[PDB]
Design a protein around this ligand. Structure first.
Ligand SMILES: OC[C@H]1O[C@@H](O)[C@H](O)[C@@H](O)[C@@H]1O
Ligand SMILES: OC[C@H]1O[C@@H](O)[C@H](O)[C@@H](O)[C@@H]1O
Ligand SMILES: OC[C@H]1O[C@@H](O)[C@H](O)[C@@H](O)[C@@H]1O
Ligand SMILES: OC[C@H]1O[C@@H](O)[C@H](O)[C@@H](O)[C@@H]1O
Lengths: 822, 822
């Protein structure tokens, strides 16, 4: 069953019941200011840093989940309710929430009163803005008191929740009932201290009253759903002095039948230059100039409406780079709208804040930066370019890099340090793609430091060389790369050997040496080894290139021998050299990562889909028989039922969950592409459909999480909860699925010397057109598709039949028409 | 107004309403296993380590506060309620909660049904046990279904609340409906991996049904107060697979009028040897032997009742060391019962967990270990002795020590390291007191390592020498000890100079050198310098002693000159040698720490209370005019109204809170004693009364926190919330107040060569007897007291008038009678 439906025209998902299987959130804000917003108005806002600069408080593991948010308590003749349904849970005659691009509306009607709220963060604005519309839809008169509600976080969220001995005493506000454009509350905790910023909560009309103390507003022994002030019908005008500060105003609205009222609220993040902090000599009153300026900017519905439409323009113009038209409206909505939206969010948010990720840790995987870039680089190339240079500057001079990178500080994480031997090659993956997309080889010439050390700068290409050579000099007895702490799979820790709860599986190493090898880094070395060879060759470094090709060929040999178990690739070699991922064993006979990434790199690919002796085909057939379920392909099988001390975290998970038999979506697109590579488009589109939001909307009660975005993890076949997802939104599944549907199924992928036009999607999408803007030009690609295994497209270019699958990059401002037949 | 009353004969505080100003908790367990228990049954349990080994989940900053705990949902013919009132909040005909020593009872009656629950942790047991008694007090028949409720924490509480990406997938249970003695649930999260321990939740009767999944028991979009299973009237028999695991059973009870039912529940922490973890070969089923054994131990009311009484015996026998009988029952109840109880708790719990301290950080201040010891050393000398040796082993070879000590690991905290130059002398304060109490000078001969380094062991006395000499070699231009990062006052950071939110005020040092001095360490050096001199001299090290006396005399000189502002002592010298705590300034003219500790050490004490030119009297008169309020003495005055970058954290607090103008109770007993020293007992007893639980019970609505225990912080005169407390229970206020009332007001303090009998309490306690057991002997001390300033007691010993105030230590098993006249 479903709990809403897609509104393609509006570019929205519309949730028609407050009773979802789990809270479904949206992301607001696209620059420095962000918001988490559920269909019930829960979650929070933060500027830049979701740990140190969080404006509002949100409790993970609340009972019930999503119990606090931005609330507008309606008091209608004594009866108190909220349009978000929660916290109050009053019977609503109508409820609807619409999640769109950088905004959401929530609407509730009860007893002849309808409240619509537009939530969004404006462009060029560090503020969450609420446009409220109250409509008397009854035949009688209405006289209402509306109580707005926000609960503040004391900025640093880790502290706010763990350091009560200090922080129950530092809460401070200022109250400005007669604000230039209405009424406003200032949460200024620690502005007295080292903070040069405060928060503002305001409404563009004169408030009847207010409240900044949470215990006075809500009452003792009261849940948000029973708050005392709204039931009383009148604000308590509480002034906070420590404890829990809130933003709250009462607004009086009288309405004839059919008559409506519009109100605008702003949640703002205001900073001041250090010298400009105080309005007064005594340094007690905050300087509110900038806060008034922001509030002058949203004093009217007309202003607000314009900021909104502008936001709509931003996103409208942003998503013009790639779109498709098909028989299949689910594919269309994913390719054009929801998958691209999700990829921008992963860029803007990294892995900081989610209903699952708790926003306390500020870091993000070096490997995750790089994979994420592949999904948004067609949208924001100049930004992408700047990202590639940021992360590459933290790279150690020996080729390794920090396993985690801080986007806010643009520095590697020292505490975690290095050691994950797949991390380095990921920088090549990022560079190569960025350049194929833009043709900006100039970046390779850009100066980049090692470990952010001034005067150590070398051309970026030399960094790729460090990354390439790192694997060459760190191989094991079989010639496969040493795994180090882990490869892509963080829970594969072969140098951990831990028996002590609370030691870090990824960092702690209880045995010093060993020979642990990974087939996945091997496959990655062949794949991104050849991309590096391509870049060195074009660069004019022919000697370096042929030589790197030489290593790549060596790794290709190793995989197909020491890396091959007979019907699929081994996953790794352990500390003592015994194989991992072999049919000889009982559990973890087969792992998905090396099967997909290795065939992604042509290793084992024979003559065709018919070449069933081709290892790549044996592997892919093994992946189908042993790992693929209706819900996606599981990570390995069988899952580990007892703890394997030699293998780190992977076996600490119960069968069917996460890295132990979970369906890790991130790595499924690897098999999908591998399937287009070997020439089985139908099987590739099948797999892609099994894990894609649009196609899972029907089984929402199983999925639980948002039907519009990818989640990291869907419980595998050995979990009772199979089909159930966790960890939605922030995941490399987005980037890799976009790259899969856009470049391999649809078949439109940038190359250095032109645009490949190679569709591989199977019979289920017989016809489609792709519109893409590449190098200033627009290509219109009209595909007629039998979808037959091993059929590749013939291009007709601008009315003239051509040979091969590459289309030459036309000049900027050009329109090229490409006819493809499969 | 009050919310209960003291029950002295039961040794309990009884809270007669569920509607306290704030949740009032108790501590259960006295060995390895502890529980936090509010008057509403909220809080949690943990074994040893409140961070890594926490059995049950508790949310700080819940709305409303205290919303989850151990709940027994009563379903009486459809009407669902709880005896703890919360979560459900059903109208109760009767409610009462009684907090006693290591146990509590909670009782609720609604519609002819009464449920009494005895909560306690048994001696020699790692388990919280609940004795439930259901009594049909109506004239009609009753048929009830009781639903027990516990919500598990996934052991590591920091992880459990921040690592959802991993931990929403690792929740596991086992359900045993037919347990040897009833029904039991096993929470075994991560037992699959590195944990050798699980938890058990059971009832000594056959359960009708069960539930281990929180979302099924409580329901979607439901608060604990609305849980779905109890409303339904029947358990859902949920099996937890990830998400949130709970312990819950339904029990069917039918009752004729007047007839009652008794049920026993156990919350248990069961470990297994590594080789004994599994009942099965497949290693899937937990070995429940030890869990069954524990449950066999509490299968009956008779067993339970005996464990209870034994617990009562433990505490009855434990608090036999010191008691007083007086006209004043509040003094009596504090001296005999509540103050002594609180001191044991600080020992057992350190600073790990309370409703204000969040149990995530495992550490405790080195200085706090030492001061705490002074309050419980008469109770548990052998343990104390072991503590003194534990902390002293982490001390660096140069005299400094870790500022924080881990009691569980018996290791100094490395991350925080050293630098707080008052910390070292605190080890002398601990040793000297322990030895005066016991006469065990043998400890001074004990081998102790520096920084836990094998082979570095030196006699303990040498450690005291390191501590003594550390101050001698770390003095400033005026001859006062360099403050380092801070002295006792952690928020006095003179080498911080920070302007960056999130830098640690106590550790980060933005300026390398300076000359910051502290008068408080100076006073501490004179006080504990002379104790050290006494110990070296007795030890036979005459040269070392006279020499240390020499330094002590030098420090005395410095304080009364470079340390004296005219009418009180300066607080310190800053980084650039400018005074802090001087009448020349506008804010922080006077600080309390150096006034009390310095006169505690006789610095400035003249001829008598009449000697008004004596600096000690000027200082103490200054403390009275400028710092003392009806609620206690404030920390400094006036409080800082703007941030002082040169002074660290102290000024980040708003006036009247914590270290900036808050009433820090810990340091008030310093002035109180200093007042008995100068000979003003009435003023000393006045001050003591202003901050003591028994005497504040009347103004509970102001205090807010528990009226039976000391809190760390009462808002000072410049806070609007003046009179309001925070941070109850875990504080050095307990130790120091006990030492104040027991040794200085009442006047009974151990010395090396005998027992001083020197009362100084003022007119308000005209007569009292003290019963003290010291060195195996019992002293009965009968005081007749005019309470006149400057009157000190004349001892008559065993019928014979004697001279001076010292009574010779009689042999073990003796009874000495001491008559005192004042
Ligand atoms: O780190 C512990 C310290 O935190 C500071 O913020 C508090 O003001 C102080 O009372 C406490 O000792
Ligand atoms: O464990 C597999 C993957 O897990 C993800 O949670 C991490 O972000 C990613 O870096 C890793 O490759
Ligand atoms: O450190 C982040 C990692 O945490 C592990 O517990 C998870 O299994 C893995 O998916 C994730 O990448
Ligand atoms: O800050 C003053 C006091 O604060 C307490 O929290 C610290 O534990 C104690 O060491 C210090 O003396």
């Amino acid at each position: 069953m479903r709990y809403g439906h897609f509104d393609d025209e509006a570019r929205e998902y519309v949730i028609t019941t407050p009773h979802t299987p789990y809270p479904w959130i949206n992301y607001l804000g696209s620059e420095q200011f962000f918001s988490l917003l559920s269909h019930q108005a829960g979650g929070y806002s933060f500027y830049r840093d979701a740990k140190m600069r969080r404006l509002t408080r949100y409790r993970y593991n609340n009972i019930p989940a999503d119990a606090g948010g931005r609330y507008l308590y309606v008091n209608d003749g004594g009866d108190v309710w909220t349009p978000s349904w929660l916290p109050v849970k009053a019977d609503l005659d109508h409820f609807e929430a619409r999640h769109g691009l950088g905004y959401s509306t929530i609407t509730g009607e009860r007893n002849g009163v309808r409240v619509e709220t537009l939530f969004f963060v404006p462009v060029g604005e560090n503020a969450e803005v609420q446009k409220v519309t109250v409509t008397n839809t009854s035949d009688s008169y209405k006289s209402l008191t509306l109580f707005s509600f926000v609960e503040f976080c004391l900025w640093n969220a880790q502290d706010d929740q763990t350091n009560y001995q200090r922080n129950l005493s530092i809460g401070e506000v200022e109250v400005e009932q007669e604000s230039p454009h209405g009424s406003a509350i200032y949460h200024r905790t620690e502005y007295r201290e080292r903070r040069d910023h405060y928060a503002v909560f305001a409404v563009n009309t004169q408030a009847e009253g207010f409240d900044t103390d949470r215990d006075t507003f809500v009452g003792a022994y009261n849940s948000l759903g029973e708050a005392a002030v709204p039931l009383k019908g009148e604000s308590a005008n509480s002034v906070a002095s420590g404890w829990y500060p809130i933003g709250s105003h009462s607004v009086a609205v009288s309405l004839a039948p059919g008559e409506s009222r519009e109100l605008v609220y702003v949640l703002g993040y205001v900073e001041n230059p250090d010298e400009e902090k105080w309005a007064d000599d005594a340094k007690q009153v905050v300087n509110k100039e900038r806060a008034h300026a922001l509030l002058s900017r949203f004093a009217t519905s007309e202003q607000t409406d314009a900021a909104f439409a502008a936001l709509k323009d931003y996103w409208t113009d942003l998503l013009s780079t790639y779109s498709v038209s098909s028989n299949d409206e689910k594919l269309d909505r994913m390719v054009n709208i929801w998958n691209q939206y999700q990829c921008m969010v992963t860029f803007n948010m990294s892995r900081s804040a989610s209903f699952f990720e708790t926003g306390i840790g500020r870091g993000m995987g070096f490997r995750d930066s790089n994979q994420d870039l592949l999904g948004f680089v067609h949208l924001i190339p100049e930004r992408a370019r700047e990202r590639i240079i940021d992360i590459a500057s933290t790279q150690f001079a020996d080729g390794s890099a920090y396993h985690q990178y801080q986007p806010l500080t643009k520095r590697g994480n020292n505490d975690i340090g290095s050691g994950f031997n797949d991390d380095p090659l990921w920088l090549i993956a990022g560079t190569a793609a960025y350049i194929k997309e833009t043709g900006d080889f100039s970046i390779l010439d850009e100066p980049v430091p090692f470990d952010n050390e001034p005067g150590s700068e070398v051309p970026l290409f030399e960094h790729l060389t460090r990354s390439f050579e790192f694997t060459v000099t760190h191989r094991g007895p079989h010639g496969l790369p040493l795994i180090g702490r882990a490869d892509w799979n963080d829970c594969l820790n072969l140098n951990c050997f831990s028996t002590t709860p609370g030691e870090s599986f990824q960092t702690t190493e209880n045995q010093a040496g060993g020979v642990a090898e990974s087939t996945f880094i091997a496959a990655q070395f062949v794949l991104y080894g050849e991309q590096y060879a391509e870049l060195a060759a074009r660069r004019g470094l022919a000697d370096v290139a042929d030589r790197a090709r030489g290593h790549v060929a060596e790794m290709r040999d190793a995989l197909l021998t020491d890396g091959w178990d007979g019907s699929w690739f081994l996953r790794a070699y352990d500390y003592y050299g015994n194989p991992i991922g072999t049919d000889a064993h009982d559990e973890g006979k087969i792992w998905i990562e090396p099967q997909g990434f290795a065939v992604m790199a042509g290793v084992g690919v024979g003559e065709g889909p018919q070449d069933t002796d081709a290892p790549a085909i044996k592997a892919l057939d093994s992946v189908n028989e042993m790992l693929a379920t209706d819900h996606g392909m599981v990570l390995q099988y069988p899952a580990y039922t007892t703890y394997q001390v030699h293998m780190g975290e992977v076996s600490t998970y119960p069968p069917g969950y996460k890295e132990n038999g979970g369906i890790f979506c991130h790595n499924n697109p690897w098999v999908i592409i591998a399937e287009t590579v070997v020439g089985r488009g139908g099987r590739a589109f099948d797999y892609y459909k099994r894990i894609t939001p649009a196609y899972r909307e029907d089984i929402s009660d199983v999925h639980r999480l948002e039907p519009y975005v990818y989640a990291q993890m869907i419980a595998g076949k050995e979990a009772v909860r199979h089909g159930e997802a966790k960890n939605s939104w922030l995941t490399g599944t987005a980037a890799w699925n976009f790259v899969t549907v856009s470049q391999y199924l649809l078949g439109v992928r940038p190359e250095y010397d032109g645009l490949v036009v190679d569709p591989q999607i199977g019979p289920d999408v017989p016809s489609f057109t792709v519109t893409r803007v590449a190098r200033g030009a627009t290509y219109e690609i009209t595909v007629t598709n039998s979808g037959t295994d091993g059929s590749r497209g013939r291009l007709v270019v601008d009315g003239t039949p051509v040979e091969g699958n590459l289309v030459p990059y036309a000049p900027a401002g050009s329109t090229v028409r490409v006819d493809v037949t499969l």
